[PDB]
Amino acid sequence: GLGYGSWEIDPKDLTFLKELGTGQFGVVKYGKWRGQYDVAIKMIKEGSMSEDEFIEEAKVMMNLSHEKLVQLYGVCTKQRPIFIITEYMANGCLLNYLREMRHRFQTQQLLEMCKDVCEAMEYLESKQFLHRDLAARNCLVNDQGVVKVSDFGLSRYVLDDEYTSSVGSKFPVRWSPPEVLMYSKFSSKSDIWAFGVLMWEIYSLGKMPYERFTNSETAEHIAQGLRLYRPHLASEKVYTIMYSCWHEKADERPTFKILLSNILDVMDEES
Numbered sequence: 001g002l003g004y005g006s007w008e009i010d011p012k013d014l015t016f017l018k019e020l021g022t023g024q025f026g027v028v029k030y031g032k033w034r035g036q037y038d039v040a041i042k043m044i045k046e047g048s049m050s051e052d053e054f055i056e057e058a059k060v061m062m063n064l065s066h067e068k069l070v071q072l073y074g075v076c077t078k079q080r081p082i083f084i085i086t087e088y089m090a091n092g093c094l095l096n097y098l099r100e101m102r103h104r105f106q107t108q109q110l111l112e113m114c115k116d117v118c119e120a121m122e123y124l125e126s127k128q129f130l131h132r133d134l135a136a137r138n139c140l141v142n143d144q145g146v147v148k149v150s151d152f153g154l155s156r157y158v159l160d161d162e163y164t165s166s167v168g169s170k171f172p173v174r175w176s177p178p179e180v181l182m183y184s185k186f187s188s189k190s191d192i193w194a195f196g197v198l199m200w201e202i203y204s205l206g207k208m209p210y211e212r213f214t215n216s217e218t219a220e221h222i223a224q225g226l227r228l229y230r231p232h233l234a235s236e237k238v239y240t241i242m243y244s245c246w247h248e249k250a251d252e253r254p255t256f257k258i259l260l261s262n263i264l265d266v267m268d269e270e271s
Protein backbone atom coordinates (compact mmCIF):
# COMPACT_ATOMS: atom_id res chain seq x y z
CA GLY A 1 0.00 0.00 0.00
CA LEU A 2 1.19 3.49 0.99
CA GLY A 3 4.94 3.73 0.47
CA TYR A 4 5.47 0.75 -1.90
CA GLY A 5 5.88 0.65 -5.70
CA SER A 6 4.78 -2.19 -8.00
CA TRP A 7 8.19 -3.97 -7.75
CA GLU A 8 8.24 -3.89 -3.83
CA ILE A 9 6.99 -6.60 -1.31
CA ASP A 10 6.25 -5.81 2.44
CA PRO A 11 8.20 -8.38 4.55
CA LYS A 12 5.37 -8.35 7.18
CA ASP A 13 3.30 -10.40 4.66
CA LEU A 14 5.79 -13.38 4.81
CA THR A 15 5.60 -16.61 6.96
CA PHE A 16 8.90 -18.68 7.06
CA LEU A 17 8.63 -22.59 6.97
CA LYS A 18 11.88 -24.52 6.08
CA GLU A 19 15.49 -24.04 4.78
CA LEU A 20 16.30 -24.98 1.13
CA GLY A 21 20.04 -24.11 0.74
CA THR A 22 22.98 -22.01 2.02
CA GLY A 23 26.24 -20.57 0.60
CA GLN A 24 28.70 -17.68 0.31
CA PHE A 25 26.00 -15.70 -1.51
CA GLY A 26 23.49 -16.13 1.36
CA VAL A 27 20.61 -18.46 2.36
CA VAL A 28 17.30 -19.54 0.60
CA LYS A 29 14.03 -20.39 2.56
CA TYR A 30 10.52 -21.86 1.67
CA GLY A 31 7.48 -19.79 2.92
CA LYS A 32 3.92 -18.34 2.34
CA TRP A 33 2.73 -14.81 1.13
CA ARG A 34 -0.54 -13.54 2.84
CA GLY A 35 -1.17 -17.04 4.26
CA GLN A 36 -2.03 -18.86 1.03
CA TYR A 37 0.58 -18.50 -1.77
CA ASP A 38 3.81 -20.62 -2.03
CA VAL A 39 7.14 -18.62 -2.37
CA ALA A 40 11.00 -18.92 -2.19
CA ILE A 41 12.94 -16.15 -0.27
CA LYS A 42 16.70 -15.45 -1.10
CA MET A 43 18.45 -13.42 1.70
CA ILE A 44 21.48 -11.47 0.27
CA LYS A 45 24.65 -11.30 2.46
CA GLU A 46 25.79 -7.82 3.60
CA GLY A 47 28.64 -6.39 1.44
CA SER A 48 28.29 -8.89 -1.42
CA MET A 49 26.23 -6.98 -4.07
CA SER A 50 26.01 -3.60 -5.90
CA GLU A 51 22.45 -3.08 -4.47
CA ASP A 52 21.23 0.24 -6.03
CA GLU A 53 22.22 -1.02 -9.57
CA PHE A 54 20.37 -4.35 -8.96
CA ILE A 55 17.13 -2.57 -7.79
CA GLU A 56 16.96 -0.51 -11.04
CA GLU A 57 17.41 -3.74 -13.13
CA ALA A 58 14.67 -5.59 -11.06
CA LYS A 59 12.08 -3.17 -12.57
CA VAL A 60 12.87 -4.59 -16.07
CA MET A 61 13.05 -8.22 -14.86
CA MET A 62 9.43 -7.98 -13.49
CA ASN A 63 8.13 -7.65 -17.06
CA LEU A 64 9.89 -10.84 -18.36
CA SER A 65 7.27 -13.73 -18.43
CA HIS A 66 7.61 -17.33 -19.87
CA GLU A 67 6.49 -20.84 -18.61
CA LYS A 68 10.15 -22.14 -18.65
CA LEU A 69 11.73 -19.03 -16.92
CA VAL A 70 11.65 -18.70 -13.04
CA GLN A 71 9.16 -15.77 -12.24
CA LEU A 72 10.32 -12.75 -10.11
CA TYR A 73 7.44 -11.67 -7.70
CA GLY A 74 9.34 -8.63 -6.23
CA VAL A 75 12.06 -7.38 -3.85
CA CYS A 76 12.24 -6.16 -0.15
CA THR A 77 14.61 -3.13 0.09
CA LYS A 78 13.74 -0.85 3.03
CA GLN A 79 16.06 -2.89 5.32
CA ARG A 80 19.49 -3.51 3.64
CA PRO A 81 20.54 -6.11 2.69
CA ILE A 82 17.63 -7.03 0.43
CA PHE A 83 15.36 -10.13 -0.08
CA ILE A 84 14.57 -11.53 -3.63
CA ILE A 85 11.10 -13.30 -3.81
CA THR A 86 10.30 -15.96 -6.56
CA GLU A 87 7.97 -18.88 -7.50
CA TYR A 88 8.57 -22.16 -5.49
CA MET A 89 10.56 -25.10 -7.16
CA ALA A 90 10.05 -28.21 -4.88
CA ASN A 91 12.68 -30.57 -6.44
CA GLY A 92 15.62 -28.08 -6.12
CA CYS A 93 18.88 -27.55 -8.14
CA LEU A 94 19.19 -29.47 -11.55
CA LEU A 95 22.89 -30.53 -10.89
CA ASN A 96 21.98 -32.39 -7.59
CA TYR A 97 18.82 -33.99 -9.26
CA LEU A 98 20.91 -35.43 -12.20
CA ARG A 99 23.45 -37.03 -9.70
CA GLU A 100 20.67 -39.14 -7.88
CA MET A 101 20.90 -42.61 -9.51
CA ARG A 102 17.51 -43.81 -8.06
CA HIS A 103 15.59 -41.88 -10.86
CA ARG A 104 16.83 -44.42 -13.57
CA PHE A 105 16.16 -41.81 -16.35
CA GLN A 106 15.14 -42.82 -19.95
CA THR A 107 16.81 -40.85 -22.84
CA GLN A 108 13.36 -39.31 -23.81
CA GLN A 109 13.26 -37.62 -20.28
CA LEU A 110 16.86 -36.20 -20.82
CA LEU A 111 15.88 -34.71 -24.30
CA GLU A 112 12.72 -33.06 -22.74
CA MET A 113 14.98 -31.29 -20.07
CA CYS A 114 17.14 -29.90 -23.04
CA LYS A 115 13.91 -28.65 -24.81
CA ASP A 116 12.61 -26.84 -21.60
CA VAL A 117 15.94 -24.84 -21.31
CA CYS A 118 16.07 -24.10 -25.16
CA GLU A 119 12.48 -22.56 -25.09
CA ALA A 120 13.49 -20.20 -22.15
CA MET A 121 16.74 -19.11 -24.00
CA GLU A 122 14.79 -18.47 -27.38
CA TYR A 123 12.50 -16.08 -25.33
CA LEU A 124 15.52 -14.20 -23.72
CA GLU A 125 17.21 -13.87 -27.21
CA SER A 126 13.90 -12.32 -28.63
CA LYS A 127 14.21 -9.58 -25.89
CA GLN A 128 18.00 -9.00 -26.52
CA PHE A 129 18.69 -10.15 -22.84
CA LEU A 130 22.00 -12.18 -22.18
CA HIS A 131 22.19 -14.81 -19.36
CA ARG A 132 26.05 -14.45 -18.93
CA ASP A 133 26.48 -17.68 -16.64
CA LEU A 134 24.31 -20.54 -18.07
CA ALA A 135 25.10 -24.00 -16.40
CA ALA A 136 23.22 -26.96 -14.65
CA ARG A 137 24.02 -25.37 -11.19
CA ASN A 138 21.85 -22.29 -12.28
CA CYS A 139 18.68 -24.27 -13.32
CA LEU A 140 15.75 -25.47 -10.97
CA VAL A 141 13.12 -28.40 -11.05
CA ASN A 142 9.36 -28.17 -9.94
CA ASP A 143 6.94 -30.78 -8.37
CA GLN A 144 5.94 -32.06 -11.90
CA GLY A 145 9.53 -32.59 -13.20
CA VAL A 146 9.65 -29.43 -15.42
CA VAL A 147 13.09 -27.63 -15.69
CA LYS A 148 13.30 -23.72 -15.57
CA VAL A 149 16.24 -21.20 -16.08
CA SER A 150 17.30 -19.14 -12.91
CA ASP A 151 19.87 -16.38 -11.82
CA PHE A 152 19.56 -14.69 -15.33
CA GLY A 153 21.98 -11.63 -15.63
CA LEU A 154 22.83 -11.72 -11.88
CA SER A 155 26.71 -11.89 -12.29
CA ARG A 156 26.77 -8.15 -13.37
CA TYR A 157 26.02 -7.04 -9.72
CA VAL A 158 28.44 -9.36 -7.76
CA LEU A 159 31.39 -7.50 -6.05
CA ASP A 160 33.94 -10.32 -5.37
CA ASP A 161 36.75 -9.97 -7.98
CA GLU A 162 37.70 -13.69 -7.96
CA TYR A 163 34.42 -14.33 -9.82
CA THR A 164 34.37 -11.48 -12.34
CA SER A 165 37.29 -11.79 -14.80
CA SER A 166 38.84 -14.74 -16.69
CA VAL A 167 41.86 -14.75 -14.36
CA GLY A 168 39.82 -15.01 -11.16
CA SER A 169 39.94 -18.28 -9.22
CA LYS A 170 36.12 -18.68 -9.42
CA PHE A 171 35.31 -17.62 -13.07
CA PRO A 172 33.32 -20.22 -15.23
CA VAL A 173 36.29 -21.28 -17.43
CA ARG A 174 34.69 -24.77 -18.32
CA TRP A 175 31.54 -23.01 -19.86
CA SER A 176 33.46 -20.25 -21.91
CA PRO A 177 34.34 -20.01 -25.73
CA PRO A 178 37.90 -19.10 -27.03
CA GLU A 179 37.08 -15.37 -27.68
CA VAL A 180 35.94 -14.90 -23.98
CA LEU A 181 39.10 -16.59 -22.52
CA MET A 182 41.51 -14.65 -24.93
CA TYR A 183 39.80 -11.17 -25.35
CA SER A 184 36.73 -10.83 -22.99
CA LYS A 185 34.31 -10.78 -26.05
CA PHE A 186 30.74 -11.53 -24.68
CA SER A 187 27.73 -11.87 -27.16
CA SER A 188 24.61 -14.01 -28.00
CA LYS A 189 27.19 -16.61 -29.32
CA SER A 190 28.89 -17.03 -25.81
CA ASP A 191 25.39 -18.05 -24.39
CA ILE A 192 25.10 -20.56 -27.39
CA TRP A 193 28.55 -22.16 -26.42
CA ALA A 194 27.43 -22.51 -22.71
CA PHE A 195 24.08 -24.21 -23.79
CA GLY A 196 26.10 -26.96 -25.64
CA VAL A 197 28.16 -27.66 -22.43
CA LEU A 198 24.79 -27.83 -20.42
CA MET A 199 23.42 -30.56 -22.89
CA TRP A 200 26.75 -32.53 -22.23
CA GLU A 201 26.10 -32.21 -18.36
CA ILE A 202 22.48 -33.61 -18.75
CA TYR A 203 23.54 -36.65 -20.96
CA SER A 204 26.52 -37.37 -18.60
CA LEU A 205 24.19 -37.51 -15.42
CA GLY A 206 26.01 -34.49 -13.81
CA LYS A 207 29.76 -35.23 -14.37
CA MET A 208 32.16 -32.16 -14.15
CA PRO A 209 33.15 -31.04 -17.78
CA TYR A 210 36.92 -31.84 -18.54
CA GLU A 211 36.86 -34.06 -15.29
CA ARG A 212 40.62 -34.94 -15.19
CA PHE A 213 41.95 -31.35 -16.05
CA THR A 214 42.48 -28.11 -13.97
CA ASN A 215 40.92 -24.73 -15.15
CA SER A 216 44.46 -23.65 -16.51
CA GLU A 217 44.80 -26.96 -18.54
CA THR A 218 41.18 -26.60 -19.91
CA ALA A 219 41.92 -23.08 -21.31
CA GLU A 220 45.01 -24.44 -23.20
CA HIS A 221 43.06 -27.52 -24.60
CA ILE A 222 40.33 -25.23 -26.01
CA ALA A 223 42.69 -22.68 -27.56
CA GLN A 224 44.45 -25.53 -29.47
CA GLY A 225 41.07 -26.45 -31.02
CA LEU A 226 40.24 -29.62 -28.98
CA ARG A 227 36.70 -30.46 -27.50
CA LEU A 228 34.51 -32.57 -25.11
CA TYR A 229 33.66 -36.06 -26.57
CA ARG A 230 30.36 -38.09 -26.88
CA PRO A 231 28.48 -39.17 -23.65
CA HIS A 232 27.50 -42.90 -23.71
CA LEU A 233 23.69 -42.07 -23.44
CA ALA A 234 23.74 -39.60 -26.47
CA SER A 235 22.87 -40.94 -30.01
CA GLU A 236 24.94 -39.74 -33.02
CA LYS A 237 22.12 -37.22 -33.93
CA VAL A 238 22.04 -35.71 -30.34
CA TYR A 239 25.93 -35.41 -30.27
CA THR A 240 25.79 -33.49 -33.66
CA ILE A 241 23.46 -30.82 -32.03
CA MET A 242 25.72 -30.17 -28.90
CA TYR A 243 28.95 -30.17 -31.13
CA SER A 244 27.45 -27.44 -33.52
CA CYS A 245 27.50 -25.00 -30.45
CA TRP A 246 31.41 -25.28 -30.25
CA HIS A 247 32.54 -23.91 -33.78
CA GLU A 248 35.87 -21.90 -33.49
CA LYS A 249 34.17 -19.06 -35.52
CA ALA A 250 31.36 -17.42 -33.43
CA ASP A 251 29.41 -16.39 -36.60
CA GLU A 252 29.12 -20.07 -37.75
CA ARG A 253 27.29 -21.18 -34.50
CA PRO A 254 23.39 -21.60 -34.68
CA THR A 255 20.64 -19.33 -33.05
CA PHE A 256 18.28 -20.64 -30.24
CA LYS A 257 15.36 -20.77 -32.86
CA ILE A 258 17.42 -23.16 -35.11
CA LEU A 259 18.47 -25.34 -32.06
CA LEU A 260 14.75 -25.73 -31.04
CA SER A 261 13.86 -26.96 -34.60
CA ASN A 262 16.79 -29.52 -34.49
CA ILE A 263 15.65 -30.87 -31.03
CA LEU A 264 11.93 -31.30 -32.16
CA ASP A 265 13.10 -33.23 -35.33
CA VAL A 266 15.14 -35.74 -33.22
CA MET A 267 12.20 -36.21 -30.75
CA ASP A 268 9.93 -37.18 -33.72
CA GLU A 269 12.54 -39.68 -35.16
CA GLU A 270 13.52 -41.31 -31.81
CA SER A 271 9.92 -41.56 -30.54
Ligand SMILES: *CCC(=O)N1C[C@@H]2C[C@H]1CN2c1ccc(C(N)=O)c(Oc2ccc(Oc3ccccc3)cc2)n1
Nearest residue numbers: 020021028040042086087088089093095137150151152
Ligand atom coordinates in the same frame (compact mmCIF):
# COMPACT_ATOMS: atom_id res chain seq x y z
C1 LIG B 1 22.82 -26.59 -7.32
C2 LIG B 1 22.51 -25.14 -6.76
C3 LIG B 1 21.98 -25.12 -5.31
O1 LIG B 1 22.30 -26.07 -4.61
N1 LIG B 1 21.19 -24.11 -4.83
C4 LIG B 1 20.64 -22.95 -5.56
C5 LIG B 1 19.77 -22.25 -4.50
C6 LIG B 1 20.62 -22.51 -3.26
C7 LIG B 1 20.68 -24.02 -3.43
C8 LIG B 1 19.21 -24.39 -3.59
N2 LIG B 1 18.68 -23.16 -4.19
C9 LIG B 1 17.31 -22.90 -4.43
C10 LIG B 1 16.36 -23.93 -4.24
C11 LIG B 1 15.00 -23.71 -4.51
C12 LIG B 1 14.58 -22.44 -4.93
C13 LIG B 1 13.11 -22.21 -5.25
N3 LIG B 1 12.66 -21.22 -6.17
O2 LIG B 1 12.29 -22.99 -4.70
C14 LIG B 1 15.61 -21.38 -5.10
O3 LIG B 1 15.15 -20.12 -5.46
C15 LIG B 1 15.83 -18.97 -5.86
C16 LIG B 1 16.91 -19.04 -6.74
C17 LIG B 1 17.50 -17.84 -7.21
C18 LIG B 1 17.01 -16.58 -6.83
O4 LIG B 1 17.61 -15.39 -7.31
C19 LIG B 1 17.34 -14.96 -8.61
C20 LIG B 1 18.04 -13.86 -9.13
C21 LIG B 1 17.84 -13.40 -10.45
C22 LIG B 1 16.90 -14.02 -11.29
C23 LIG B 1 16.16 -15.11 -10.79
C24 LIG B 1 16.39 -15.58 -9.45
C25 LIG B 1 15.93 -16.51 -5.94
C26 LIG B 1 15.32 -17.71 -5.47
N4 LIG B 1 16.93 -21.64 -4.84
